[PDB]
Amino acid sequence: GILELIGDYSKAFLLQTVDGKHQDLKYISPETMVALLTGKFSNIVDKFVIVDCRYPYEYEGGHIKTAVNLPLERDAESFLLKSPIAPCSLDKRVILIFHCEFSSERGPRMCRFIRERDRAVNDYPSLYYPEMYILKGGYKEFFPQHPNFCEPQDYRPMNHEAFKDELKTFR
Amino acid sequence: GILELIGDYSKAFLLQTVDGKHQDLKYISPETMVALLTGKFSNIVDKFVIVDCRYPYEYEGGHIKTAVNLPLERDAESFLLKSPIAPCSLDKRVILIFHCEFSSERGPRMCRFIRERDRAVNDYPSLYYPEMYILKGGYKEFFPQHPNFCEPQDYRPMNHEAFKDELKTFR
Asked: Which CATH superfamily is domain B1-171 in?
């Protein structure tokens, strides 16, 4: 029912979803992420942003193509809400996809934060980003199945030994 | 019952195990792999070999420390059975651990193959390698959790686009 309705209750979620940890959030599989990246929804989706919520060194060691790195809430808020990324056609959808390494904590968290700020600067139902998803499994599950959609085509875990300082510096 | 006994039915499996796909095989977690690598079983385990059953390009892009790359059955048979890696102390055990990228196919098969060859060159209960395990999740699960125990500290998936020919060649 209303379970499939997006942020402004105007319509159902466009993408097929899968079971995820957080019940209040919608999850998509690596496969759906590829379909989106290869234009299978080009007539319906006007724009989509992939928000890598991992820290800079993780992102720099290999991320999904076109993804933007926004680890801090102020960065995310600034990039997504200071100057709202509207559609080139008010008939088309704008979709946001969040993920981190495992898409367990940092990702889902950033997703809720943005929804809060979005509600704050709008007239209740209306949202700049009514449709948002979490990439299930994060980079850890996506990279090995579709390395060709990543760049550089590598993977640097948050636990990587050569960035322990950068890690706590970011904590 | 005999399910908890090793190949020659002489004693129980030394390492704690976890549920894995193949019921005929014993699986260990990344955590147990680390305990073994850091000497937590040095008084009981005389020697252990980690057999990376992935293809050379995968191995070269990042593998577990001390692991040997034996993708082909002839390589594995030659390295492990042409000149049996016996213990320095008869009281001590020799353990083998197989894994591939996800540890669902290549690794388990190599593990079964070696057990067959081992049975072939012995008097029934006896085996050169009575105790063997599968690293659950393979390199995919181990690398992100313990990158410091891998070298180079990177990850090259079997699907890495720049190695499509080598994959075919090895197929």
From this structure: Rhodanese-like domain (3.40.250.10)
